[PDB]
Design a binder for this molecule. Sequence first.
Ligand SMILES: NS(=O)(=O)c1cc2c(cc1Cl)N[C@H]([C@H]1C[C@H]3C=C[C@@H]1C3)NS2(=O)=O
Ligand SMILES: NS(=O)(=O)c1cc2c(cc1Cl)N[C@H]([C@H]1C[C@H]3C=C[C@@H]1C3)NS2(=O)=O
Ligand SMILES: NS(=O)(=O)c1cc2c(cc1Cl)N[C@H]([C@H]1C[C@H]3C=C[C@@H]1C3)NS2(=O)=O
Ligand SMILES: NS(=O)(=O)c1cc2c(cc1Cl)N[C@H]([C@H]1C[C@H]3C=C[C@@H]1C3)NS2(=O)=O
Ligand SMILES: N[C@@H](CCC(=O)O)C(=O)O
Ligand SMILES: N[C@@H](CCC(=O)O)C(=O)O
Ligand SMILES: N[C@@H](CCC(=O)O)C(=O)O
Ligand SMILES: N[C@@H](CCC(=O)O)C(=O)O
Lengths: 260, 270, 270, 260
Amino acid sequence: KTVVVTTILESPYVMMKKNHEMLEGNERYEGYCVDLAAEIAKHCGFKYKLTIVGDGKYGARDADTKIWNGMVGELVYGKADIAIAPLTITLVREEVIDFSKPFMSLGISIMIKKVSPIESAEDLSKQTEIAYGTLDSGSTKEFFRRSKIAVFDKMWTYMRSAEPSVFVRTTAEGVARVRKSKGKYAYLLESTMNEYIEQRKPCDTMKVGGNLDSKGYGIATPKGSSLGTPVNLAVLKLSEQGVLDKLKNKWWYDKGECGA
Amino acid sequence: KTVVVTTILESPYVMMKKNHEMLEGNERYEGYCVDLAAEIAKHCGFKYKLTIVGDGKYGARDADTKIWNGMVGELVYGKADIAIAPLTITLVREEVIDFSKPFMSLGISIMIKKPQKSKPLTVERMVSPIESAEDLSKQTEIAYGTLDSGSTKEFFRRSKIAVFDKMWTYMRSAEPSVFVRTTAEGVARVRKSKGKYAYLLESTMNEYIEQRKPCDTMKVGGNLDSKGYGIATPKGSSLGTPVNLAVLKLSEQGVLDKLKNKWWYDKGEC
Amino acid sequence: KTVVVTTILESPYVMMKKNHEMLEGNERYEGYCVDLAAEIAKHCGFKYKLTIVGDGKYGARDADTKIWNGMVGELVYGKADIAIAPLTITLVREEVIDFSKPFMSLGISIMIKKPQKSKPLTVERMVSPIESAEDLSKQTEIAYGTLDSGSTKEFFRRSKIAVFDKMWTYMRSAEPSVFVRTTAEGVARVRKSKGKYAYLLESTMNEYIEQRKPCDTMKVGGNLDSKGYGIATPKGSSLGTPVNLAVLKLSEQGVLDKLKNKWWYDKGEC
Amino acid sequence: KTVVVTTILESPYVMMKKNHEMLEGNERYEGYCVDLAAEIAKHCGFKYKLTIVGDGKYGARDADTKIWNGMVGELVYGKADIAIAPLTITLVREEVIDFSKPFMSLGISIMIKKVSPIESAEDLSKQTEIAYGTLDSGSTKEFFRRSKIAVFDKMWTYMRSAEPSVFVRTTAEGVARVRKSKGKYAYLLESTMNEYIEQRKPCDTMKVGGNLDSKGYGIATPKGSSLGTPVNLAVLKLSEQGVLDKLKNKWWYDKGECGA
Ligand SMILES: NS(=O)(=O)c1cc2c(cc1Cl)N[C@H]([C@H]1C[C@H]3C=C[C@@H]1C3)NS2(=O)=O
Ligand SMILES: NS(=O)(=O)c1cc2c(cc1Cl)N[C@H]([C@H]1C[C@H]3C=C[C@@H]1C3)NS2(=O)=O
Ligand SMILES: NS(=O)(=O)c1cc2c(cc1Cl)N[C@H]([C@H]1C[C@H]3C=C[C@@H]1C3)NS2(=O)=O
Ligand SMILES: NS(=O)(=O)c1cc2c(cc1Cl)N[C@H]([C@H]1C[C@H]3C=C[C@@H]1C3)NS2(=O)=O
Ligand SMILES: N[C@@H](CCC(=O)O)C(=O)O
Ligand SMILES: N[C@@H](CCC(=O)O)C(=O)O
Ligand SMILES: N[C@@H](CCC(=O)O)C(=O)O
Ligand SMILES: N[C@@H](CCC(=O)O)C(=O)O
């Protein structure tokens, strides 16, 4: 048969090809996650057709309806068979889908515009002059919402009671908003996306401080799927062989369109 | 039924307490892994008796006998139910045991004896003979060796990268042996080798040794790779999913961060 | 039975929350006294309903009428059971109500408008015209006043110390009046008087005002005396001893100092 | 009737004068506490005879026998009627005796031999090279024993399991030990005593850091004594009239036999 793959258009994970208008199939996509999917298919021995989730959402639970949206919803409801994408491994997701071993480690990073007046997240929370937000339906808003530490809890209480809404639809919109905020907005996103953005033109953004915690991206499958252990072994073998590191260097540091 | 929890001797993971001559049971040990086991028991309720692997090894495959030894080996054959220890997740181990999500990140790092400051106006600067793994492999004045029956030895044995392949080729026929039996043995060799030996170990243990007295060693270069420490469990056991969710919950709460901070930095000096 | 806990509107002890127009009960207020009362309830279990005094005065007995007004007055006449607020322990108040062990050390300090920096090779220096209370009594270009119906005013009125007697003698006959009705009124008077008014207030509120924006005021000298804030209780009541024991418990448990640190210094805008 | 006043030989609270061998009665004692007792007797209108507790113990509970020793024991068992002395107001003591309002604020401080390498208590606890102890049968030891904060717990666990016993019989012995330790000993004692010691010859001791907590000294009477309200009123009147301030200035800073 064929394996339907869901993923989200995120750089440098999945990108539309420069000549994607005249291209069909898996040849119209490129990126770290596209290469990961190709290598996973090579190791397992299955034919795959890349698809983009209809709603550009990673996955969360809606307002008191217990409905999964985005890629996780695409998995639990049978619309997809695998999800090679930057999906963070979390408590809530692991209960409804099975995660592979992390293929990329990351944490929570603060993005600002180019003395470092913000520095640590503690100083960011103690000061109400500069604003900060996150990505809706991700693993950042749900991390702050369920946090029990006082500083993260008070950050979340600020962000939820924000006028206007501080959350952004896409991390690209968050990057644009912090770029056009004249140093008045901060974006709380994953460290890998922060590094990729700060390593590209116009190099107007930079990551400040350290990671608030440590998480990872996993490859998700429907609960109780035959693909679980094969894709877990594929991820482990790719990590052992250095293919994951080589792909990360290729899509993060090989180009390096910035002065650093 | 009480749960047998195999664990190895390693700092700051597990340390015998000062007053352990008369103390008996769970209170004998102290460190990181004991607190992790206590938190795991708190999450999913069971009674756990902390034991130590007799062989004192993390685990590997023997030569031509196809027998698993070490902590992983004794977990496979059933004399233990769960390994709450600095056990590294690998492909060969996953094929025989069930690993959980990593609870602490790590990489392969290099330990060398800390050189003396080189005065040349009156400024002291740190200079080192080894900067990366490539120049460590190119040179021959300084010998380098890994830990026997560990994750790093297996990684170098099965590495197809040219530089790592060359390091393994040197290590295989190094006379006398560059391999050690314990992390403490390798650290002592680095100490009383006058800079002629370099130890390849995990970044976590490297940092712990560097931050504690006499702190005459230092870590050079970056991390050769990226791995993690998981909680091991035999195939098909009923404890695997509970400990996986427990590790996820502890990561979410921040308990792991506080444990690492209190057992790695709050007790450091120099 | 639900206990009625009276409190005054004073920052950072009790301040109305931002979303307090749709809120009711013990959720409109936030600060130090609110969670102090929460801790008191959690120690000795009861139901407490926070109230604000109608006349907004701490407490004083008017001469020739012999009627107590303020928090102390309304606690005396049985319309409240416990006062959890910045109420200062005094001799006149102890003869009519039962105080507890102090939970907050305090002193009488001076508030002045912060002067501009002195220009002179390029260093900036802070020069103030008033440092102690003696030179405040000696000078006449800067007026000084206290809070009406407060501990400080009665302290200055009853003081037989020569310098404090002179300060009271000036204060009693001053045209226009140097006394203020609210603490915020005195702070606004200091901020708008352009350095020609010094406000005599407790050190805790003085430091809280100093640490916050727009931070254009500064405290000079040391405290004129040593006093404390106690939780009040009507004479011969059953809540006095449990309140005293709860205050001692919180003091020895580090809760009081942590609350002070996280309500006074953590949110330091300047 | 006469009133028996128990107190401890502590400077500058109670001294034994200098030509005491030819003196009898209350005229052979001097100090801050002697003046305080005289003022209390003047206010209440009673005749008092100063006595020194047989053992120089402030007060605590023995090894699982529920016997009070020292001044507190001298009060609960009826051997004394009032205790004008530097007795710290504590939770355990208040349950057995009546404490007046504090007549002197204070806290727990660190003293060492004359930039300090430890300064704060965090560094004092972290560094095992430097040693520190308290006064036996006091309130600082009971503060550390019953504490729940991590750093105070660590300090207490160190001090109890000390070879040899780090505790001292008298605070004078603690001062002598810290002076004779060549800077290898630290003393955890009350801030007022530390200041008095550091303001005296030979000025070889200094106080570092802040105060770990804040407490006060109270005047203790047996539970349900007729004197409790009069002595509380006397303390309040003395505090309001500045008599306590004057006495502390007289016995702490008026002489000041040190270079400052
Ligand atoms: N350097 S990196 O972020 O691209 C990266 C990060 C990671 C990799 C591999 C790479 Cl290349 N593999 C590990 C996995 C491998 C085995 C050990 C830990 C998990 C299971 N997870 S990780 O520590 O999140
Ligand atoms: N900072 S650290 O090394 O102590 C550390 C390292 C890691 C932590 C948590 C901590 Cl505190 N959790 C992650 C786990 C959380 C979820 C995402 C990846 C795994 C599943 N593994 S990790 O990336 O190996
Ligand atoms: N540092 S502070 O002002 O928040 C503060 C002030 C004080 C505290 C405790 C704290 Cl945390 N406890 C004391 C009390 C405790 C026991 C000893 C004196 C009284 C009874 N009163 S205090 O000296 O007024
Ligand atoms: N400056 S001092 O340490 O000698 C000092 C300390 C204190 C004094 C008086 C003096 Cl002189 N009185 C107060 C008491 C007076 C009234 C207000 C608080 C208690 C009841 N306690 S205190 O704040 O502990
Ligand atoms: N990759 C994240 C989304 C990015 C973010 O939350 O910032 C997730 O899977 O939830
Ligand atoms: N931590 C490693 C062993 C140590 C080493 O190989 O250096 C493991 O779990 O296999
Ligand atoms: N805290 C004082 C009021 C403040 C003041 O007078 O400055 C009291 O209880 O009377
Ligand atoms: N003076 C203290 C004892 C001294 C100390 O513990 O440091 C008391 O009355 O308990």
